[PDB]
Symmetry: C2
Subunit: 366 residues, 2 copies
């Protein structure tokens, strides 16, 4: 897994300056935000019950559960899905989602219990398959911001109600995303169960929350504990802190910041650097969460080299962590800035744009 050189310099910055000098803007970061009180608690037996109770409390509030509901932590959303399918042992699973193909954990879990599986992004193909023997799973959204249409969501729930089928909402991102679109929480729509991810537009570790009718959640949690699928206390502490700190407005503001970010200095630099070399060609794109610099040079092989070099310049000189700083592609390759990142709250637009401009300039010294 080549490129512990990024690991090296991060450790150097940590040693010489400290954690406040590091800014991970890559977007792909688990957020582990526990304090000393939490750490103390995790080193006692009462820690397990303490963080499970806090997760129940703040998770129910987040998921719009009522007094007949419970919320529990799973290691990942996939873990909650496996546990649910193992516990409920449905004959068939019907999966409604915004776009094909789905994430594979549901189908894989079905294969283990020998349940039939069908998926579709067409409400018509979903309704006519619902019966007493089907578990109905609705994925509420994608990180791309596509959502299930509200009227369709209600239609699926209605048919399930008429057929006595259990409705399980995969709100891995949807518990945040659909709410940005002014949709109610899954449990408020009448879902029997909901799962969400603790790091998708939330400042927690990757992790799963499962909430819903006490009886169902209990059965599923017991099943999950047989195989260590449930979240351990250190994970529950990270989840608690993510939930305690969560506010939808923070997310809305970060989307606004990306919408408003002044990227004109990139274009200015582009024109300026052609004095040096007419093959320099900075290509950028505004994104819903920030922006991406897709290329800096016309020749493809040199382009790669410089994007990585710029990534290192950003890390070394400004403490900004991005993807280019790893070894080659496999994931993105382009220099991506995600302004929804927690660390982006610690720096202004001016800092980010200056870091970007100066890091590119440094890469093109004649």
């Amino acid at each position: 897994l080549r490129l512990e050189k990024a690991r090296k310099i991060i450790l150097e910055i940590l040693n010489e300056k400290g954690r406040d000098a590091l800014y991970d803007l890559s977007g792909l970061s688990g957020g582990f935000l526990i304090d000393e009180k939490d750490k103390a608690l995790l080193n006692t037996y009462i820690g397990s019950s303490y963080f499970a109770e806090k997760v129940n409390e703040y998770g129910l509030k987040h998921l719009g559960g009522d007094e007949n509901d419970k919320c529990v932590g799973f290691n990942r959303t996939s873990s909650a899905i496996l546990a649910t399918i193992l516990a409920l042992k449905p004959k068939k699973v019907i999966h409604y989602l915004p776009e094909l193909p789905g994430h594979p954990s549901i189908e894989r879990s079905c294969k283990i219990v020998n349940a039939k599986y069908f998926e579709s992004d067409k409400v018509g193909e979903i309704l006519n398959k619902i019966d007493k023997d089907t578990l109905v799973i609705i994925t509420g959204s994608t990180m791309d911001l596509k959502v299930i249409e509200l009227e369709n969501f209600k239609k699926v729930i209605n048919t399930a109600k008429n057929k006595e089928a259990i409705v399980f909402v995969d709100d891995a991102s949807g518990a945040r995303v659909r709410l940005l679109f002014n949709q109610p929480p899954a449990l408020k729509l009448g879902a029997d169960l909901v799962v969400t991810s603790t790091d998708k537009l939330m400042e927690g570790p990757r992790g799963g929350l499962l909430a819903g009718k006490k009886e169902l959640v209990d059965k599923i949690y017991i099943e999950g504990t047989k195989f260590g699928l449930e979240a351990q206390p250190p994970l529950l502490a990270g989840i608690y802190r993510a939930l305690k700190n969560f506010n939808l407005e923070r997310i809305r503001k970060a989307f606004e910041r990306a919408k408003n970010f002044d990227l004109s200095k990139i274009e200015k630099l582009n024109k300026e650097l052609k004095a040096i070399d007419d093959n320099i060609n900075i290509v950028y794109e505004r994104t819903p969460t920030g922006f991406v610099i897709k290329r800096v040079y016309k020749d493809d092989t040199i382009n790669i080299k410089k994007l990585i070099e710029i990534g290192f310049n950003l890390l070394k000189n400004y403490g900004i962590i991005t993807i280019t700083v790893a070894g080659m592609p496999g994931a993105s390759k382009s220099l991506r800035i995600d302004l929804t990142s927690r660390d982006a709250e610690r720096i202004d637009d001016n800092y980010i744009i200056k870091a970007i401009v100066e890091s590119i300039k440094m890469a093109f010294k004649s």
Copy 2:
């Protein structure tokens, strides 16, 4: 889950004094020992690869693996067992263990893959069932300190070798316990795979380590990741710190301390307090890991009440956390002190014995 009153006072001590004033001697504690550098790293994308690499390095060293081996973290030992059985899909699993009955995760995992399962603590019943279609699982020890006889361990491994069967050692405690008995690590005995727990005679969270032939470990880890069975980075950080800090001699010394602990002041107090009330009857027992106070009063109902009260007196006045401080039995009930606990390193015998004597005396004020 009655008795957040223990949670309450722990939080009071934490606020008023701090974490160094708390000593969890109950024995049943997950040890989450990460530092600020670790916490910093967990808030970056490079954290996942960093702690996975450290776990591989220190886990291989702990488990006596060679250059052809890898060590990976699972959420729990049960998670590693499920992942292994899901990946290898054996027709039959043969489970050799020191005493019946076994822990259920293996049999439960077998039920999911429709594999046959057999267990026995008799080497004779194990050898004649081994064939090409059997996964052979040897549980090396119990926390009770019973171990598989070395010659039996070698016999099982030999038969498996002759039958081309895979040998998987459940060293959940055995990776420490069997070594106290001067046995080699599982991988050194020729096991293809080994699993151990990161909190059984080790200062880590509950968690699983799976080590062995690179190819096998890779297959199993990929299978585990389908369902979030693998350890997330915050858990890997706790495991790393447990492994880095691990030394067998520390465990040997704690066992010696328990062996040598002067408990005579308990007997002295017993005689002294009969002046007050001839129904007071302190009954204690030395344990391999420390000692237990089993009763303090002849009447059973009052006995219960006072044991809990003493537990609270220990917590309030001396910061010692034990089981009696929770609501009634279900687990132990008696006041147990486990000197293998990390927090026991922060206090001398004098402190513990004085805390115990004074806490009992306080409970019997006339």
